[PDB]
Amino acid sequence: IVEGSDAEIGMSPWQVMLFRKSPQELLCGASLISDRWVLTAAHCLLYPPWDKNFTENDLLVRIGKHSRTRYERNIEKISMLEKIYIHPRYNWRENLDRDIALMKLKKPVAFSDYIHPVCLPDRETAASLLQAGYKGRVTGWGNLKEGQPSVLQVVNLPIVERPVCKDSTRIRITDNMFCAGYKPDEGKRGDACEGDSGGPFVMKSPFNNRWYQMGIVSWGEGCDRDGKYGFYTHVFRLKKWIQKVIDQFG
């Protein structure tokens, strides 16, 4: 996250760190959606142009974290992967369309003050909240500039109009993406960056005061560049796939 701030303790208790076993490194962000399912970006797990193809056994999920590098004894929980599910129409070849993947954990994680699942949007919360100018929140341990943070970073960013998103890039944008961030004329800045991938873009519903995950950090051109925007997987659009996976494999 660039131009963000340190998270408060327990501010994002659905934040998940994807952690590679060897070498022990941050892989990606992710989010807790129930006691056994974690949501992330598909490119975090499968991106052949970069020779990326991780299997269950290659990673761990660390939940309840704050500090990036520290082992947060008595607070974080570390979970092993039972199975990865990538969207069958994820388009790694061109534009990262349908950039979404699910991970089932071997065992349920225990909720606590620091570990708690986020909601997934219903069609109505989505229509209400996904509006140009409405702000969401992005969190992660990624780069601070286009070094690395000591603790989880947060930034609030406004959703951008679809014509503005398209005109800012040469990438073919799809209905399964949205972009967010300030315009150069708006005097505020901030963006996700490498390492923030897979983490959640959340909004707090004003109707029921619950946090919903509207997006997944997916891609961008550099980080926090003037006239560029961050792009996010549109969670509500891929919900059918999400439910089908959880309904089919518990």
Binding site: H116, P117, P158
Partner: peptide
């Protein structure tokens, strides 16, 4: 059922430092 309600915030009726920025944009 209890999704999206944070133990250290909504469950205690405490607000984090910038959530109101979000609320104020839901115009």
């Amino acid at each position: 059922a209890d999704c999206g309600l944070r133990p250290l915030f909504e469950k205690k009726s405490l607000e984090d430092k910038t959530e109101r920025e979000l609320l104020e944009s839901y115009i």
